[PDB]
Design a protein around this ligand. Structure first.
Ligand SMILES: C=C(/C=C\C[C@@H](O)[C@@H](O)[C@H](O)C/C=C/C=C\[C@@H](O)C[C@@H]1O[C@H](C[C@@H](O)[C@H](O)C[C@H]2O[C@H]([C@H](O)[C@H](O)CC[C@H](O)/C=C/[C@H](C)[C@@H](O)C[C@]3(O)O[C@H](C[C@@H](O)CCCCCCC[C@@]45C[C@@H](C)C[C@@](C)(O4)[C@@H](C[C@@H](C)CCCCC[C@@H](O)[C@H](O)[C@H](O)[C@@H](O)[C@H](O)[C@H]4O[C@H](C[C@H](O)[C@H](O)/C(C)=C/[C@H](O)C[C@@H](C)[C@H](O)C(=O)N/C=C/C(=O)NCCCO)[C@H](O)[C@@H](O)[C@@H]4O)O5)[C@H](O)[C@@H](O)[C@H]3O)C[C@@H](O)[C@@H]2O)[C@@H](O)[C@H](O)[C@H]1O)CC[C@H](O)[C@@H](O)[C@H](O)[C@H](C)C[C@H]1O[C@H](/C=C\[C@@H](O)[C@H](O)C[C@@H]2C[C@@H]3C[C@H](O2)[C@@H](CC[C@H]2O[C@H](CN)C[C@H]2O)O3)[C@@H](O)[C@H](O)[C@H]1O
Ligand SMILES: *[C@@H]1O[C@H](CO[C@@H]2O[C@@H](C)[C@@H](O)[C@@H](O)[C@@H]2O)[C@@H](O[C@@H]2O[C@H](CO)[C@@H](O[C@@H]3O[C@H](CO[C@H]4O[C@H](CO)[C@@H](O)[C@H](O)[C@@H]4O)[C@@H](O)[C@H](O[C@H]4O[C@H](CO)[C@@H](O)[C@H](O)[C@@H]4O)[C@@H]3O)[C@H](O)[C@H]2NC(C)=O)[C@H](O)[C@H]1NC(C)=O
Ligand SMILES: *[C@@H]1O[C@H](CO[C@@H]2O[C@@H](C)[C@@H](O)[C@@H](O)[C@@H]2O)[C@@H](O[C@@H]2O[C@H](CO)[C@@H](O[C@@H]3O[C@H](CO)[C@@H](O)[C@H](O[C@H]4O[C@H](CO)[C@@H](O)[C@H](O)[C@@H]4O)[C@@H]3O)[C@H](O)[C@H]2NC(C)=O)[C@H](O)[C@H]1NC(C)=O
Ligand SMILES: CCCCCCCC/C=C\CCCCCCCC(=O)OC[C@H](COP(=O)(O)OCC[N+](C)(C)C)OC(=O)CCCCCCC/C=C\CCCCCCCC
Ligand SMILES: CCCCCCCC/C=C\CCCCCCCC(=O)OC[C@H](COP(=O)(O)OCC[N+](C)(C)C)OC(=O)CCCCCCC/C=C\CCCCCCCC
Ligand SMILES: CCCCCCCC/C=C\CCCCCCCC(=O)OC[C@H](COP(=O)(O)OCC[N+](C)(C)C)OC(=O)CCCCCCC/C=C\CCCCCCCC
Ligand SMILES: CCCCCCCC/C=C\CCCCCCCC(=O)OC[C@H](COP(=O)(O)OCC[N+](C)(C)C)OC(=O)CCCCCCC/C=C\CCCCCCCC
Ligand SMILES: *[C@@H]1O[C@H](CO)[C@@H](O[C@@H]2O[C@H](CO)[C@@H](O)[C@H](O)[C@H]2NC(C)=O)[C@H](O)[C@H]1NC(C)=O
Ligand SMILES: CC(C)CCC[C@@H](C)[C@H]1CC[C@H]2[C@@H]3CC=C4C[C@@H](O)CC[C@]4(C)[C@H]3CC[C@]12C
Ligand SMILES: CC(C)CCC[C@@H](C)[C@H]1CC[C@H]2[C@@H]3CC=C4C[C@@H](O)CC[C@]4(C)[C@H]3CC[C@]12C
Ligand code: ALF
Ligand SMILES: [Mg+2]
Ligand code: NA
Ligand code: NA
Lengths: 993, 294
């Protein structure tokens, strides 16, 4: 699976003669292969079917998730926890259940988090399966001189294959004889343009020559013959499919950010452990205790719910998106749009509507503009002159297409029309502002029509005149404006007629160049009243000789047409450029059309200029001008084929408005790679199959949904179910938003680690009884903290997020040291002081003063010392002192909740004040209320001091943590004040997350 | 990377910052942590002002009182061989540590040990819990009162020939008045004989019905010859108001103990403000496992 040999541009043999090609493959042009030779080649090369990818079972991925994230740090502990049980059961000591209910709780945490990480794990694309559904089941092959329909898989290289309008090309063929055959190279070019396949050769590029039919296409009309040159994994869209299924997915930014966050966390956990080991050796503890202490500190620094919390956080935004018809297959992708700095878009079908629409019209020496928007929300074109009526008669009569039966329900533009795109566009415009064409057509009976000719270059027909006062004959004709201009001598001005003097002939030339320069295709319409005296109502004008005056006609006016852009395309492109996002057009379309749509949508701002434009404005050769004076550049695919790596880097490094035209799919992949190379995230928005290799290697794919295909839909990460381009703007707002929110929730969940680890550090150092218990740390981490932190995600913006430039990937991170300095350094420290304060209060009120607590652990823990003297001389049994220690765990946990109130409030806003933003978030309020109700419930419910070991508190204790909370609030409030008044100062480069 | 992020010589940076940054950050954390320490200390001083020196504010976690014992047995088991002397050393060292506080040399002079009734008597109130009349006075408790377990005659206290002693003690509680059961028709079997209102009775027995036969003669030694605690040593006024205070003790000799067999002996005190707990096996009663294997 050599990827480089698949990135190279394809090669072929269309230059050889028919006979020569047969020598290269071994066949008969009039008899084909023999059943013996055909089967022999069937055993030699293999079947004509795209093969399937290697598949990954699911017990594999779920298990992978088990030994991942920091679940490894938790395994060392669940397993260690059991080891101690085995030792107790085999050494015969305690039948109690502490160790075990912990190995079971830790194991359960790992199993549940695994489920949460799976829900987020990239889904497994079925690129090849969709692709495989492409090839039809039975082809028509001519063997031994007879026609037979055989399984397409049984087609080999060399035999004769016949195709008919409506069938799919079973393999890569070399046309030998055609009869008006046309193919739809949508899958390779990206255009529904009907190309024609002729046995003769016409271009050095195999993709442009007509003597080659391509797999993955269909013969729209006509019949043809040919020879099989490529079958299987060797075909063109076959090389593209094989490249698509074998192009890595990448690693999203949210993931890389999670990697960095994990790294940071594990760093401080191993630092604190190595430090308390050297300390435990300087004080005296044995090696068994020093090693056990190390393991305890590391595991204690792991936050059980921050990974699952990030999953819930991302899911709520994906639902908000689902409300605006924006569905994301990958949850991680949701964020990629906000971090994108360069959007590579497709034109036909994505930037436009892929529906030829009448754009501009010429009549009465005046250019008129028509509404070319989906929902018809614009300006009419003044339907009050007689000229327009005559124009409607010309176009509506000299047109053979008709709406498809049963469209009486859909609107006028989205209905199906059988015919060319020009006659269809004209029919739709006339049916739009002139009523039903079916009655307009039956109101005037067509007598004789002479079809479009390759020599005449026009289309004409005569019909009766519905004037009940004029029984004469009407003649109408349409065609290229130059040919029709050479056939007129009058002009229908404002209704009356006038001669064709050079004044209006020059006005017609300037109008032709005006509509032509607009990237539009123009046509000319003229008509004439046949004199009923020289051609009576009974005379039949058989289409044989000159029965109609070719010249001396009456020209009425020109009519242009082009594929317009979707409604919110210009506004969305402008919004993206406003946010500092570089827009680049990439399409396999003609550079004239591509450039016109670029200037019309905002890619090439009006005023910027290309090197050819400067050479034309000055009238000098192009090799003289300097390329640095040109901001925008149009790069052609043929030229793109011959360019080095550095040249592409310079093209993107010096030109701000770029457009790649006539580019194949492999080149699309190359351009995306040229972007990522420097160091930016890329988003590709497409519709057809040639966007598949560009959507796979990009960082995020956006597929349309209504106007797309199944390959682009399955190979994308985000789907736009209504083809509303504006969803891209919404996604760039929400991405940044959901980015700024993860920081707040992370700081919130990282602040409570300190008041959770410090008690054990004091237990081993200062030799005081144990302040905080294991069953309390677990109830906090998975209970109280979750709801307030999941609610932080719903927070609104502070400033206009659509104004700042895209974040930098190498420097701006998600978790930086500025956060650690706040959670681990300033807020968590105060929380620890409040907890220890409530602790000392509980022990001082019951008889154990602070001076007598230092140095007691050895006797405070012993299970056989039933006489422990306190500061007043009383004698406490073992269970009696243990009850007080547990009541201290309960009040410590309640102190944590009290300080989390002020932490959730100071974490609500990173910069702004609370009196500005406001407490409009109902989930946060509910979080505080529930957080308090749960603590009261865990302490006061009967049977809790039996099950969980939490005793009731006396009402005076609940107020020992209040001052610390107010202080936290005031400190952070003054913190978020100097940042506002002083931008760029010490407080900013030291505490601004 | 490796080398640069450690020391570059153009910006004169170490680990990432310059000389003045480490100073700004160190000074900030010094001032911050200093304020933190001062605030914690102030909030602890107001706490020293809240509480009283002669009485714990809350006395609900220590009631009723426990019942501890010497020796110091781990897992509540007293197992020793009558031949190997290095088997009951850990026990004697404890027993001795406890009795070493009742030496007559310590109890001398008028203060603060006054001579009290040689026979059980009633309570004695030395006033309130104040500093007005200085250090209160506590009754003297002589060693010799315990007859065969005093370490004065047979230092070992009995462990030498298969006859051990167990000095039981009631947990000291401030302002706690012991209340014995009255002579009414409802009273345990044992307590009927020798009802001395002024004595809190202590009586040991066998946990299981079978072990009864295997346990011999429980001989209690105490004040006045009774198997209890004299009410005159109460109440206790606390360390601050009654330093040099001695709590009564009761010796128990388990004579005629079957050899080479684990015996479960449960001792229990009786009284009104005495209540046992199924969770705390030392509240009012206590359990001992004795096995004189020889
Ligand atoms: C399951 C776990 C593990 C344990 C769980 C545990 O609890 C339970 O399961 C229990 O185990 C249950 C298991 C039961 C198993 C069986 C039982 O059923 C059955 C029953 O067990 C009962 C016992 C049971 O009752 C026991 O007691 C249970 C406890 O066990 C542990 C004990 O304490 C302790 O182990 C007792 C065991 C024994 O003592 C061990 C002895 C040693 C092995 C050894 O020494 C003996 C001996 O020598 O070994 C020999 C074999 C040799 O080959 C070995 C080779 C030795 C190698 C030597 C190299 C050393 C070394 C190593 C180098 C790397 C570094 C280096 C520096 O040192 C370097 C230096 C060199 C150069 C040194 C060379 C020295 C040479 C030494 C050697 O040669 C040998 O000694 C020599 O060969 C000898 O032969 C010889 O005799 C030598 O003797 C001498 C040697 C010296 O002694 C020795 O060297 C010494 C002193 C060294 C000193 O350090 C030196 C010092 C002075 C010092 O250096 C010094 O100078 N300082 C001077 C300072 C100074 O000047 N200052 C001047 C000042 C001026 O200013 C002599 O010197 C030498 O010369 C001589 O050569 O090299 C050989 O065999 C023999 O010789 C043997 O005797 C403790 C516990 O395990 C357990 O409680 C039995 O009584 C009963 O009969 C039986 O039936 C997972 C843990 C949990 O995760 C965790 O929770 C854990 O539980 C907590 C941490 C517990 C802690 O907290 C608890 C309370 C609550 C906790 O539980 C909560 O959980 C807290 C949590 C924590 C966190 C936070 C929070 O809270 C919670 C939240 C977490 C959740 O939320 C999170 C989110 N936030 C998520 C989630 O995680 O988690 C407490 O209760 C605990 O107590 C407490 O620990
Ligand atoms: C409370 O009283 C304790 C007992 O007091 C004794 O009896 C009372 C009634 C009075 O008559 C009093 O005057 C008596 O002293 C008292 O403890 C006693 O302290 C002395 C002084 O250290 C100890 O004497 C020393 O004994 C050892 C050997 O002891 C053996 O027996 C004991 C058990 O009794 C075991 O524990 C030991 O392991 C030994 O098996 C002698 O080797 C030691 O020699 C020293 O003196 C000689 C001269 O006699 C010198 O030549 C040597 O160099 C040594 O300096 C002593 O003779 C005595 O053993 C000890 N009794 C007990 C039972 O332990 C206790 O200190 C008093 N406490 C307070 C707070 O008042
Ligand atoms: C605590 O209580 C016991 C028992 O009291 C008795 O039972 C209570 C539940 C309640 O009903 C009391 O009213 C009731 O007395 C006290 O000890 C008892 O004392 C009496 C009197 O000495 C004894 O009765 C004696 O019984 C003998 C045979 O068992 C008999 O020979 C004795 O004769 C004496 O009295 C007769 C007159 O009846 C006289 O003629 C004789 O000359 C001789 O004096 C006598 O009847 C009980 O046996 C005792 N009970 C026990 C269990 O020993 C006890 O003194 C009291 N303690 C205190 C400090 O108050
Ligand atoms: C009983 C007692 C209780 C004890 C409780 C202890 C609780 C522990 C509390 C906190 C733990 C602190 C551990 C250290 C945390 C450092 C954070 C860290 O490592 O985060 C990682 C950052 C990366 O950040 P980034 O991605 O933005 O980088 C982008 C770089 N780009 C873009 C240029 C490429 O790396 C960096 O910051 C660079 C690394 C800097 C390391 C500094 C080490 C300082 C540690 C100790 C100093 C002690 C001195 C005391 C004496 C003072 C003098 C009086
Ligand atoms: C000694 C004890 C120490 C304790 C320390 C811990 C304290 C932490 C707990 C509570 C702190 C409360 C802080 C009060 C802040 C009030 C701020 C405020 O009022 O700013 C006014 C805002 C701004 O409005 P605007 O101009 O933007 O509107 C524009 C409207 N347009 C658009 C229509 C024009 O108005 C709004 O936010 C809209 C109205 C919102 C009203 C919120 C009322 C609820 C407040 C607190 C809930 C109680 C929690 C209790 C937890 C304990 C559980 C047992
Ligand atoms: C917003 C999203 C929230 C997501 C969170 C998920 C919600 C989780 C919901 C429920 C899980 C809670 C399970 C608690 C299990 C307690 C088991 C227990 O109590 O069993 C009692 C045993 C009995 O032992 P025995 O038979 O020997 O007694 C003999 C006594 N004799 C002989 C003296 C009579 O005692 C022992 O095991 C003693 C050891 C005690 C072990 C306690 C372990 C509890 C661990 C974590 C608790 C966290 C749950 C907090 C609630 C959150 C609500 C949202
Ligand atoms: C129970 C828990 C109690 C907790 C109470 C905590 C109270 C302690 C609060 C603050 C004490 C720390 C003060 C540290 C002052 C020395 C810091 C220093 O050396 O700073 C130098 C800079 C001036 O250098 P530069 O920026 O011009 O150079 C530019 C250089 N380049 C480029 C690096 C930016 O200083 C500046 O910027 C000015 C920044 C000064 C920092 C203001 C922070 C104020 C925070 C809290 C005060 C509010 C307390 C409310 C308590 C109510 C209690 C009921
Ligand atoms: C102490 O216990 C012993 C038994 O160990 C008792 O003496 C036994 O008495 C029976 C008769 O009931 C004799 O058959 C045995 O031979 C005796 N054995 C010994 C070793 O003497 C003795 O009466 C008990 N004494 C006390 C005071 O309880
Ligand atoms: C703004 C700052 C300076 C105000 C600080 C107020 C201090 C002095 C207040 C706040 C909360 C108070 C404590 C609240 C509850 C109790 C429990 C009671 O049984 C003894 C007093 C004690 C321990 C109080 C002592 C005084 C105290 C610590
Ligand atoms: C707002 C901040 C900066 C004020 C901090 C005030 C500090 C410096 C004050 C608050 C309470 C004070 C303590 C109150 C009581 C005592 C007991 C006395 O026998 C020695 C001094 C000592 C220990 C004081 C030292 C200074 C102290 C700790
Ligand atoms: F629509 Al084409 F590339 F632009 F797919
Ligand atoms: Mg397309
Ligand atoms: Na945490
Ligand atoms: Na992708």
């Amino acid at each position: 699976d050599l990827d480089e040999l698949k990135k190279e541009v394809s090669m072929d043999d269309h230059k050889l003669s028919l006979d020569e090609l047969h020598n290269k493959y071994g066949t008969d042009l009039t008899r084909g292969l023999t059943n013996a030779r055909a089967k022999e080649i069937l055993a030699r090369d293999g079947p004509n079917s795209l093969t399937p990818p290697p598949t990954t079972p699911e017990w594999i991925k779920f298990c992978r998730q088990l030994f991942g994230g920091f679940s490894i740090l938790l395994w060392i502990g669940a397993i260690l926890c059991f080891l101690a049980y085995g030792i107790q059961a085999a050494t015969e000591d305690e039948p109690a259940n502490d160790n075990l209910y912990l190995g079971v709780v830790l194991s359960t945490v790992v199993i549940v988090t695994g489920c949460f990480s799976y829900y987020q794990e990239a889904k497994s694309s079925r690129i090849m399966d969709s692709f495989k559904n492409m090839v039809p089941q039975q082809a028509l092959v001519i063997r031994d001189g007879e026609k037979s329909t055989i399984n397409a898989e049984f087609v080999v290289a060399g035999d004769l294959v016949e195709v008919k309008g409506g069938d799919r090309i079973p393999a890569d063929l070399r046309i030998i004889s055609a009869h008006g055959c046309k193919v739809d190279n949508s899958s390779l070019t990206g255009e529904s343009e009907p190309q024609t396949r002729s046995p003769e050769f016409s271009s050095e590029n195999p993709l442009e020559t007509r003597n080659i039919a391509f797999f993955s296409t269909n013969c729209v009309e006509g019949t043809a013959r040919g020879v099989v040159v490529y079958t299987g994994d060797r075909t063109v869209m076959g090389r593209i499919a094989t490249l698509a299924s074998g192009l890595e997915v990448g690693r999203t930014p949210i993931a890389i950010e999670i990697e960095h966050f994990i790294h940071i966390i594990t760093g401080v956990a191993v630092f604190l452990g190595v430090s308390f080991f050297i300390l435990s050796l300087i004080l005296g503890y044995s090696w068994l205790e020093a090693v056990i202490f190390l393991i305890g500190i590391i595991v204690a620094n792991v936050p059980e719910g921050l990974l699952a919390t990030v999953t819930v956080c991302l899911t709520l935004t994906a639902k908000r998106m689902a409300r605006k018809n924006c569905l994301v297959k990958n949850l991680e992708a949701v964020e990629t749009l906000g971090s994108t700095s360069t959007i590579c878009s497709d034109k036909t079908g994505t930037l436009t509507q892929n529906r030829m629409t009448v754009a501009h019209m010429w009549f009465d020496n005046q250019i008129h503009e028509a509404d070319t928007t989906e929902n018809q929300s614009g300006a009419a074109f003044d339907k009050t002159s007689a000229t327009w009526s005559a124009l409607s008669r010309i176009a509506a009569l000299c047109n053979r297409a008709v709406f498809q039966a049963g469209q009486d329900n859909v609107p006028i533009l989205k209905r199906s029309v059988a015919g060319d795109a020009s006659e269809s566009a004209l029919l739709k415009c006339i049916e739009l502002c002139c009523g039903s064409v079916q009655g307009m057509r039956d109101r005037n009976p067509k007598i004789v029509e002479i079809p479009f000719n390759s020599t005449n270059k026009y289309q004409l027909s005569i019909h009766e005149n519905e004037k009940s006062s004029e029984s004469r004959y009407l003649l109408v004709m349409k065609g290229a404006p130059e040919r029709i201009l050479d056939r007129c001598s009058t002009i229908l001005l404002n209704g009356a007629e006038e001669p064709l003097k050079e004044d209006m002939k020059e006005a017609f030339q300037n109008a032709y160049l005006e509509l032509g320069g607009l990237g539009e295709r123009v046509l000319g319409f003229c008509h004439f009243a046949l004199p009923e005296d020289k051609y009576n109502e009974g005379y039949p004008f058989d289409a044989d000789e000159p029965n109609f005056p070719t010249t001396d006609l009456c020209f009425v006016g020109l009519m242009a047409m082009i594929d317009p852009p979707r409604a919110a395309v210009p506004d969305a492109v402008g919004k993206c450029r406003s946010a500092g996002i570089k827009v680049i057009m990439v399409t396999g379309d003609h550079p004239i059309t591509a450039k016109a749509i670029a200037k019309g949508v905002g890619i090439i701002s009006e005023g910027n200029e290309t090197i050819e434009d400067i050479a034309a404005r000055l009238n000098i050769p192009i090799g003289q001008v300097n390329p640095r004076d040109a901001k925008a550049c149009v790069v052609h695919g043929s030229d793109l084929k011959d360019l080095s790596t550095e040249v592409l880097d310079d093209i993107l490094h010096y030109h701000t408005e770029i457009v790649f035209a006539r580019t194949s799919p492999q080149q699309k992949l190359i351009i995306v790679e040229g972007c990522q190379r420097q160091g930016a995230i890329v988003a590709v928005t497409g519709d057809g199959v040639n966007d598949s290799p560009a959507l796979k290697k990009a960082d995020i794919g956006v597929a349309m949904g209504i106007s797309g295909s199944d390959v682009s839909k399955q190979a994308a990460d985000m789907i736009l179910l209504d083809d509303n381009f504006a969803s891209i703007v919404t996604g760039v707002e929400e991405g940044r938003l959901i980015f700024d929110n993860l920081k707040k929730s992370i700081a919130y969940t990282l602040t409570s680690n300190i008041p959770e680890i410090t008690p054990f550090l004091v237990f081993i150092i200062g030799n005081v009884p144990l302040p905080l218990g294991t069953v309390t740390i677990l109830c906090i981490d998975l209970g109280t903290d979750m709801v307030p932190a999941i609610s932080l995600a719903y927070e609104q913006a502070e400033s206009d997020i659509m104004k700042r430039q895209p974040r930098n990937p190498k420097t701006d991170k998600l978790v930086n040291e500025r956060l650690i300095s706040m959670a681990y350094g300033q807020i968590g420290m105060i929380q620890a002081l409040g907890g220890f304060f409530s602790y000392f209060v509980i022990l001082a009120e019951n008889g154990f003063l602070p001076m007598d607590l230092i140095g007691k652990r050895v006797r405070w823990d012993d299970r056989w010392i039933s006489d422990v003297e306190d500061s007043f001389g009383q004698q406490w049994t073992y269970e009696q002192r243990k009850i007080v220690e547990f009541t201290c765990h309960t009040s410590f946990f309640i102190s944590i909740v009290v300080v989390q109130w002020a932490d959730l409030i100071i974490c609500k806003t990173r910069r702004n004040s609370i009196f500005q933003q406001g407490m409009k978030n109902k989930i946060l309020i509910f979080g505080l209320f529930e957080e308090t109700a749960l603590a009261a419930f865990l302490s006061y419910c009967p049977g809790t001091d039996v099950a969980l070991r939490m005793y009731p508190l006396k009402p005076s204790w609940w107020f020992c943590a209040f001052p610390y909370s107010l202080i936290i609030f005031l400190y952070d409030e003054m913190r978020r004040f100097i940042i506002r008044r002083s931008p760029g100062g010490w407080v900013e480069q030291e505490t601004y997350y | 990377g490796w080398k640069k992020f450690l020391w570059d010589s153009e910006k004169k940076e170490f680990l990432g910052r310059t000389g003045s940054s480490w100073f700004k950050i160190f000074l900030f954390y010094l001032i911050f942590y200093g304020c933190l320490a001062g605030i914690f200390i102030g909030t602890i001083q107001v706490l020293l002002l809240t509480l009283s020196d002669f009485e714990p504010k809350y006395q609900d976690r220590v009631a009723p009182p426990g019942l501890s014992h010497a020796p110091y047995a781990i897992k509540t088991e007293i197992s020793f061989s009558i031949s190997n002397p290095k088997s009951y050393e850990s026990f004697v060292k404890s027993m001795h540590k406890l009795m070493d506080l009742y030496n007559e040399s310590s109890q001398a002079g008028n203060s603060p040990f006054e001579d009290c009734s040689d026979t059980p008597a009633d309570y004695i109130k030395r006033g309130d819990l104040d500093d007005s009349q200085g250090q209160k006075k506590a009754c003297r408790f002589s060693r010799m009162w315990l007859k065969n377990c005093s370490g004065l005659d047979d230092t070992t206290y009995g462990y030498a020939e298969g006859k051990p002693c167990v000095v039981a003690k009631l947990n000291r509680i401030i302002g706690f008045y012991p209340k014995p059961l009255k002579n009414t028709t409802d009273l345990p079997e044992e307590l009927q004989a020798n009802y001395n209102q002024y004595v809190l009775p202590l009586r040991c027995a066998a946990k299981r019905e079978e072990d009864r036969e295997k346990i011999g003669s429980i001989e209690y030694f105490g004040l006045g010859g009774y198997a209890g605690f004299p009410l005159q040593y109460y109440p206790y006024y606390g360390k601050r108001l009654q330093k040099k205070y001695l709590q009564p003790l009761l010796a128990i000799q388990f004579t005629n103990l079957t050899q080479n067999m684990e015996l479960r002996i449960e001792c229990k005190v009786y009284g009104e403000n005495i209540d046992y707990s199924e969770k705390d096996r030392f509240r009012g009663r206590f359990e001992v496992k004795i096995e004189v294997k020889s």
